[PDB]
Each structure stands twice: as C-alpha cells, then as structure tokens.
Amino acid sequence: MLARSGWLSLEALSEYGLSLAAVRAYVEIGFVEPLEVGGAWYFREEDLLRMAKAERIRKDLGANLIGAALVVEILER
Amino acid sequence: MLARSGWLSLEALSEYGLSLAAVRAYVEIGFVEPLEVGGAWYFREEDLLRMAKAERIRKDLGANLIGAALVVEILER
Amino acid sequence: VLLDVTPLSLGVETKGGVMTVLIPRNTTIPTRKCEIFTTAEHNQTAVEIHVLQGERPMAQDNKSLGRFRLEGIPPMPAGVPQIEVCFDIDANGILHVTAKERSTGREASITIQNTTTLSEEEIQRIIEEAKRHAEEDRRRREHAELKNALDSARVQAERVLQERQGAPEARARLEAAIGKAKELVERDAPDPELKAATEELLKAVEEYEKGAQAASGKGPDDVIDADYKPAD
Amino acid sequence: VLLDVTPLSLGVETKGGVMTVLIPRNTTIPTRKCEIFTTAEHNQTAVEIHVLQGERPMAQDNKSLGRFRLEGIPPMPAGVPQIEVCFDIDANGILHVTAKERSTGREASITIQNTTTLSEEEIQRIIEEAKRHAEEDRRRREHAELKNALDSARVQAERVLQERQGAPEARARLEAAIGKAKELVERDAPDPELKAATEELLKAVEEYEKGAQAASGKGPDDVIDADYKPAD
Amino acid sequence: AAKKDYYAILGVPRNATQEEIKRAYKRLARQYHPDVNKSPEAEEKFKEINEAYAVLSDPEKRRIYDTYGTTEAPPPPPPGGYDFSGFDVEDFSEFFQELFGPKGRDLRAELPLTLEEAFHGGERVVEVAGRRVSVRIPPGVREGSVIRVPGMGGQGNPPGDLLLVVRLLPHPVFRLEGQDLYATLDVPAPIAVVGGKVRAMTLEGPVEVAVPPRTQAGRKLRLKGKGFPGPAGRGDLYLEVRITIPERLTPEEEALWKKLAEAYYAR
Amino acid sequence: AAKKDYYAILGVPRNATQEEIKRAYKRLARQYHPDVNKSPEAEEKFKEINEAYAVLSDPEKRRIYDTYGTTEAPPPPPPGGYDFSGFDVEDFSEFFQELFGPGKGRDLRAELPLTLEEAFHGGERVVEVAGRRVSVRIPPGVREGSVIRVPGMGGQGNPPGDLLLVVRLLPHPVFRLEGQDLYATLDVPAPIAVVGGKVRAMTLEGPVEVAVPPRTQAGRKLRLKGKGFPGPAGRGDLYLEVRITIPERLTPEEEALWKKLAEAYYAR
DSSP states (O other): BBBBOOOOTTHHHHHHTTHHHHHHHHHHTTOOOOOOOOSOOOOOOOHHHHHHHHGGGGGTOOOOOEEEEEHHHHHOO | OBSSSSOOOOTTTGGGOOOOHHHHHHHHTTTOOOOSSSSSSOOOOHHHHHHHHHHHSTTOOOOOOOOHHHHHHHOOO | OOSSOOOSSSSEEEEEEEEEOOOEEEEEEEEEEOEEBBBBTTTOOOOOEEEEEEESSSSSSEEEEEEEOOOOOOOOOSSSSEEEEEEEEOOOOOOOEEEEEEOOOOOOOOOOOOOGOHHHHHHHHHHHHHHHHHHHHHHHHHHHHHHHHHHHHHHHHHHHHHHOOOOOHHHHHHHHHHHHHHHHHTOOOHHHHHHHHHHHHHHHHHHHTTTTTTTOOOOOSSOOOOSOOOOO | OOOOOOSSSSEEEOSSSOEEEOOOOOOOOEEEEEEEEESSSOOOOOOOEEEEOOOOOOOOOOEEEEEEEOOOSSSOSSOOOOEEEEEEETTTTOOOEEEETTTTTEEEEEEGGGGGGGOOOHHHHHHHHHHHHHHHOHHHHHHHHHHHHHHHHHHHHHHHHHOOOHHHHHHHHHOOOOOOHSSTTTOOOOHHHHHHHHHHHHHHHHHHTTOOOOOOOTSSOOBBBBBSOHHH | OOOHHHHHHTTOOTTTTHHHHHHHHHHHHTTTOOTTTTOHHHHHHHHHHHHHHHHHSSSSHHHTTTTTSSHHHHHHOOTTTOOOOHHHHHHHHOHHHHHHHHOOOOOOEEEEOOHHHHHOOOOOOOOOSSSOOOOOOOOOOOOTOOOOTOOOSSOSOOOOOEEEEEEOOOOSSSEEETTOOOOOEEEGGGGGTTEEEEEETTTEEEEEEOOOOOOOTTOOETTTTEEEEEESSSOOOEEEEEEEEEEEHHHHHHHHHHHHHHHHHHH | OOOOOOHHHTTOOOTTOOOHHHHHHHHHHHHTTTTOOOOOHHHHHHHHHHHHTTTSHHHHHHHHHHHTSSSOOOOOTTTTOOOTTTOOOOOOOOHHHHTTOOOOOOEEEEEEEOOOHHHOOEEEEEOOOSSSOEEEEOOOOOTOOOOOTTTTTSSOOOSOEEEEEEHHHHHTOOOOTOOOOOOOOEEEEEGGGTTOOOOEEEEETEEEEEEOOOOOTTOOOOOOOSSSSOSSSSSSSOOEEEEEOOSSSHHHHHHHHHHHHHHHHHOO
C-alpha cells in the first residue's frame, strides 16, 4: 500500500547512459539539487532529463557547463 | 574623398582586451565570419560586441563554446 | 570473483500488484540498496510492505515470504512522506528489510534467511515459465500500467481536489468517474475502456484546472438560447 | 636594441575633415599597416587620396604630403568597393602609400620618404599645442562627430531613397532635410540646431520605414474631420 | 533529384576548402541541433547537415565523394569500400540512397485545417515531405491532439509514428478563440423594440435566430444544442451582437423617421 | 537595516556549509548574470548574490562574517584587515556600508508609469528610484522608449551615473491607444445616420461636442485633425470609431411612433 512515484536513485543512470562522475560535476555546480538524506543522491524523473539533454550536447563541444545554455533553453521555452 | 565606415582591422582588437588566439579559435569554430581578402582579417563592430559579451561569460566558466550560450540568446531576442 | 550471485530479483509490491524490484537478478552479495517510496492517501499513518520473490509482474502470481505493516508514520499528505525500504543482503544472505523514515525514523526490520533458496530445477521452472507466459505477460503489463494510470487519474482528482475546489460540475464529473473507478478496480474494465477513461479524466482535469471562474467570453450578466430552428 | 622608431601617427583624411590614423605613434622598424575605406555615391569611378600628418581632429590645420588619384571604381552603389590603402614604413622608413582597387587591380601607390620626419622642437610644439587646444578640441570633436552623424544621416537618406520609395510627404520631409544639409554644412550651423535636425531625421526615417501603405486604423475608404467645437 | 548544394546549406562558396566547411558546420549545427533547437523542421535539416559533412570532411573523399556532379557522368563506387567512421550514416537523404544506399522517428508535422474540416474530420490524404501517408482524424478535434498512428511515421526499423498537430486556419468571418466564437451578429435597430429574426451565420450554417426585445449592445448569447461538439462536450458559441443602420432607405422611411429624429433632438 | 537573508537568496538552510553555498551561487550567477539576463532588475540581484558569495567563501571568513546576524550585536571589526580579493566590492548593499563602509557610476535604468494625461503633459516630477532621492522632468509629448538621460543624477559612484527612465504608457481605462491612434468606442443612437447630429465625445482634449455626417455606417473612423495627440513629429490625430446603439429608455409614445417603421422592417 505504498505508491511508486518517489524519485530516481543512482541505478537508472546506466539505463539513461549517465556516468556518476558527470552527475557529481553537475551537482557540485548547481545544475540539479539532489536529496542526500540519508544515503545517496536522488532525483526526479525530469531532473534526470535535464542532464540527459546536457550530456547529448557534449557530443561535439565543450566543457561541463553546457547547462548554462540549458538553463536559458528551458527558460527560452 | 572617402568615408570612414570600412571594417575593423587587427589594431582595433587591443582596445577591447581580446586575445588574438581566442579570435583565431572563434573564427576557426565559426562563430564569426572574417574577411581574409586580401591579407589579414576585417570585422564589424557588433562582431566585437558579441565577443565582448561572450568573453564576460568566460570570467567564471567555461570552455570555448559560449557561442552556443549566445547564438541561442540572440535567437531568443 | 565470488559465487552466490543472487538468483532472484527482489522488490516490494505496489498498487495493482506491480513489482518494484530493488535488487535485480545476477547481482552480487553483500548488497545494500533502496530508494524513496511514497504513500497513497491523506494522513496515511501506516504502510503495508510485502516483499516478493519472482520476476513475473503480478504480485498474485508471485510468492510472498514477508507481509508486514509499518505504523508510527507521521500524518502527512500523500507523496511527501518518503519511506526508505532498504534491503541489506549480508555475507550470509539474510534479507534485512529496514523500513526507515526520513521524517522521524521509525523502523520495522525483518530477516528472511536463505532457506527459501530454490534449486536449479525451480530456477529453470520459474525462468522458463515467465518466458513461456511473456506474450501474455506483456498484455498484463499493458493492463497493469494502465490500471495504475487510472489510479493516477484518481489521485490527481484526489490531490488537486483537496488542494483546489474547482467547478462543482467538474467536481461531480470527478466523483462519478471515481465511482466508476471503484466499480472497475475489483471489477476491472477492458483496456479500451481503461484508456478512454484515463484520457477522459485527463481532459476532465484539464478543464478542472481552468484557473479563474467561468470566463464565458467577456463575462456577461446572462444569456439566452436562440431559436435556431425556422419560425414565423 | 634598434632605433629610428616612427615619430608620427600617419593616416588619411576622411569626410568632413576627420583624422583616421593608420600607423600610430611609436611603431617599430620595419612596419606595414593598412585598412579599407569606402565610397560615397552611385556610379563612382574617381578616387582622390589626401595623406595627412597630425593628431588633432581638424584637417585645415594638418599638413598634407600627397594628394593623388586612383580611378576605375566599378559603377556601383556606395560602400561595396573596398579601396585598400596601405601605409608601409619600410625598413628604410619611407612611407609607401598604396591604393589598390580589389575588383580589377587598379593601383596608385606613391612614396612619401623619411624627409617628412620632424625635429624634436616641432614634435614638442605639436604635442604641447595639441594639448593647449585640447579643451576646445573635444568641443570641436563633439561638433565634428555630430556633423558626421548628420553626414551619415544624409547618406542614409540617399541610400534609402534610391533603394526604397516611401510616402510622398515623408519623402518631402527627407528632401527638406537634404536641402537643410546642403545649406548648413558649408555654412555649419551651431550644435543644438544640428542635434534637433538629426533626431528629427531619425524620427522621419522611423516613420519612413513603416513598411506597407498608409493604414489609418482598419484603413477605411473615407473619413471626415469632426467639428470638435461646440455647436447647435 | 539533383545534388543539393551543401555549400549553400552550410554557407560556403563552391570552391571552399576544409576550413570554411568546418567553420560553417560548427555554426549551423550549433543552431539546428535537435537538443538546442526544438522545431519540427530542424531534424530533417540536421540530417542533411550531418550527411553533408559525412562526405565533405577529408581531402581523399574530397577527391572521391565531392566530385560527384562535377564529372560528365556519376562515377561508379570506388574499389575498396567506404570509410564513414564516427558519423551516423544509416538515415541519409534520397541522393545518397540513389548513389550507394546505406528506430523510426516520431516525425512531427502539422495539419492545416479550417473550423469546418476540423469539426467534420473524416478521412484525408495527409502530405508528408516526399513519402506517402493517409490517415484520418476523428471528428471533434481541437488543438494539441496527438494523432499517433503506428507504422505510419518516418521510415525505420521498426517504423516510427506520426505527431500530427492540428493548425486551425481562421475562417474569414468565423473567429474562434478557445471554444467560443466571436462572430459578430450584425442587426438593425428595430430588434431592440419587439424582437425580430436574423439569418445568422454559424458553424451549423445559415440559421434563423430570434432575440428578446430591449437588448443592448455587447450582449452575448449562448447557443445550446447548436454549438461545437468535441471531446469534452458541445462547446456553445457566444456570438456578440452589433447594431447597425439600414443603408438603403425610402422617402416614406424619411417621412416616418423625421418625427422621431425630432424626439432624438429633444432627447 | 537588518540582514536580508542571503541563505534565502541562494536557497540553502541556515546551517548549510560551503559546498551548498557554492552550488547555489553557481546556479544563481548562471541565471542572474547580466549578459544572460538583459533586464533592469537582474543587475541588482546579481550584485546582491555575488555580495552574498563574498562573505560565504572560506571557513575562517565564514566564522568571521557569517556570525553577523547570529551575534547578539554586530561585533567590531576583527584586527589584521580583511581579504576581498577577486571581488568587486565597491558597490555593495546598504548593509555593508553600515558594517564596514569602504566602497564610474552605473546608468540606472528604471520605468516611469505614465498615463495618457501625464505623458501628454510631462512636466516636473519626483521619480522613484530604489532607496535614494532623485527628481527630473518629462517633456510634453513623450512616447515609448524615450531615453531620459540626466548626467550626474543616476547611479552612485565616481563619477555618478545617469538615468534611463523608460516610459510605460499606462493603459487608460476607456482610452485604448495603439501607436498614435485612439480606438475609443463612440457609442451613439441610430438617428445620427439619418440627419447627422452631435455627440459629447470625451478625448484627450476633454469633453468635446463632435459632429457626424448623415448615413454613417457603423464601424467607420473619423479623423481628428487639430485636436489629436501632439507629439515630437507633429499632431498625431486620433481616429475614433463610431458605433450604433439603442436608446435604453423608451416611451409608449416611442412605441406608437415606432410601429410604422417596425412594420416597414417587417416588410423590408
């Protein structure tokens, strides 16, 4: 009698093709805010879609902060 | 009997505090179109104004494709 | 490289008899894994946790070795209370199930030992029977995620209704559809009806989320019906 | 170390008597620098080039070493033919002034030897007299750059008129401004008059680039002037 | 058909070398990228772009691939196979399919319809760019309805689905905003005294409509039983009235109107 | 005055340590950067957010500064001086002027809410910048995007900044002005389309009696030359539209004299 909505753990990242080191780099710069208490990080489904968009714009260039062009992009819509 | 409109030569670069290596790199990646004929390059005023905004976003982060964060932004205007 | 790799995918049952596997098969030991889980109703002070062994999505088709209850959960609106139902498989292979709570910290740990380990005959039996039934198991999956989508429409007509009192006609629509849900959960409807009801309730909440009052144009005082049919 | 650095900032004359330096002060030996300039009108084949020496903005007080002609500019709307003017202070120091026409290869390049290198007394004289005049020189620079704004307005009103046709009344206003420029550049008007005229021309070109024809609201067939004064 | 000038797509001259090609593709791909550009037209042009630099990259393929069309006839494929490393090549445009040949996408497009076609719906021979397709839209359709027809989208293995969003073309005299029609009911004055009948035009056609007496301007009238059916019900049409003057008059009308124009002068 | 919550500005709790501060600043600075946000309000927010990061940098400066507000009173300055390297701290908020003090001015851009009457008249006015004092005048005939630049009356600094006071033309309730034409509805009864009468129309000039030609069909515009809306390029006329209404109060005599043309409309 527990609803399965919650958040997404560090397990689905491999299914989404997102390395843990990249998630660390995104977290320490503020691209997305996880839920630490009480164990590992946790994210919403569309929270994992933002660096999923971000890690597809890395396929040409450049460094880690492409989320800057993404925060504007979601603000562009 | 000539009017001072022309373009910007390789002497106006120093007024805006631009390193010529960055100028060459951004020409080579295609953010701005040069005028090679017949010797050095020649640019427009707003070409050095786009780069002026783009290099103020280098003061924190990150690498050379801030044009991605700018080409969108001008396309958002 | 070590032996005793997990021969079962273990999780917790959810609404509609749907697994939430917290540790899949061919995973090593020891392993401490868990996630965030939420509640169903308002002020829900207790949560039932039923661990399951197997891979078929139906909880009914599964075998359950642990069915316990968690009281002491502080009364908070559904979705906000997050329950850490954490599975720890130690070196011996005991399934320490700890029901941690992020808010206060109530717990109810259960130990299920390795005496439930099934032999290669039964491992092949369950694997080849799930694979044998897979063609209808995907049909049951399309049934089950659609039933949970119906439950999601119910809980969106439940969360928002207590968060916003919309149009009384829209409220009557929501209540009639909720009665349809009550009559179609232990008397489940066919999938075409399920989709035509879930999308109908999606449109019902789309018109229920209208925002301001009845903006029938510029908001006139009153109207009248026109005698469209020929007369005189 | 090596010496005989260039002691003067050599450049070209521009429209209205404005200095455009091509080699600045303190340029190493040897050196070669250039920049592209443009034309003014339609169907122009003639190039007068007037090299000048100095630093202050005015031209009549500056000294010219060469006034030659490079011809053959394609008959073409203004601005496109980029006339390449190189000042080359070679390892000899001799100021080669080169004018190429990029289209066909029209070339007129005369040489201004190091005979125009001045003494220390005259360099000090020009520096100190420029600084002495500088307080009125920034005033006349506000004058001259505003005259260049008016000149750019003149060339803009010419280019637009030969490129796009607007309403006859706005065209009449632009032509009246053109006549004002004709009668108040050789006989320069004070600054505030020119500022009011340039902003007025900016407004006129703003209402001149309106796009389509005169749409008065919905664009009715005919309108009348209402007798706003009281009657009856 | 004929080779599209990829030099025109990228923005480089005919004899541009590798440098201009790279400076062009790193510019347009930064603008037409599917991740940074969310537009239905973007994906096809992005495929054209990646195909364009699939063959414009290296000097050896510049000799081999980029001379296509420059020869008197299309030369046969060179011996030794092709080298297409690092680029997605399996969904190129018609030119490369003609030349050599080597998950279906959710192709998103538009269905431009007026109010009448959208209301009736029915079958329609829809038009994708180049390929064949024909699917129907159920009646009562509105904006934002996702017409996802399986096996009908972009070619792929397996084939993709379609994302056909309705674009309501505004009818010249029927202005629909949301589910309400702001069609003005032009009517002479005498209806505000007794209440007459006017052959109004609505989505149901020309219909006689009567109005209650003494109705002021700006009033809305709800059309129940004759509105706009849809998924959530029949959206009634809220036409607004407008009072006008008879343009053509008679001397009898002038004589009769004189004595009340006097009253208007008085009050 | 009292401390504005920099934690609430960044979005972190009171006890949040350095890394949360870093991951909140690097998101706000990525959103409220003036280059990525070309808005007047973004610059002040950017200044305040980097000011928040200035006193939240390292654990020793954390202890020294972020105890302010926590302490029972703002303590006296610590000995040995400060360290504000790499930070433009010369335009901090009023709080830092209160606490420590040491600070070309900015061209402060703001908006003047002006109705049709106020925009038409302009005149002397007391403009309202955030916190400080200023007063400038508007010339009559102001239009959208007017650059009201007053040297030495804008941002504080050496030299002081200028003003960019953009006029927001307030929508007058019954005056719908688009460009320089007023689409003001002119409601009038029908009989003016038989002879042509007068209507007490209200315009920017005030209440004026307006004449109309006979047989005027509804929806027609009438030009107002000589009494329109004057501006910088001339007197922008106002094209008000006519509209036919019904006399709301009718008499039995009206019915008696109206029956004839009612029958006429019944026939034609």
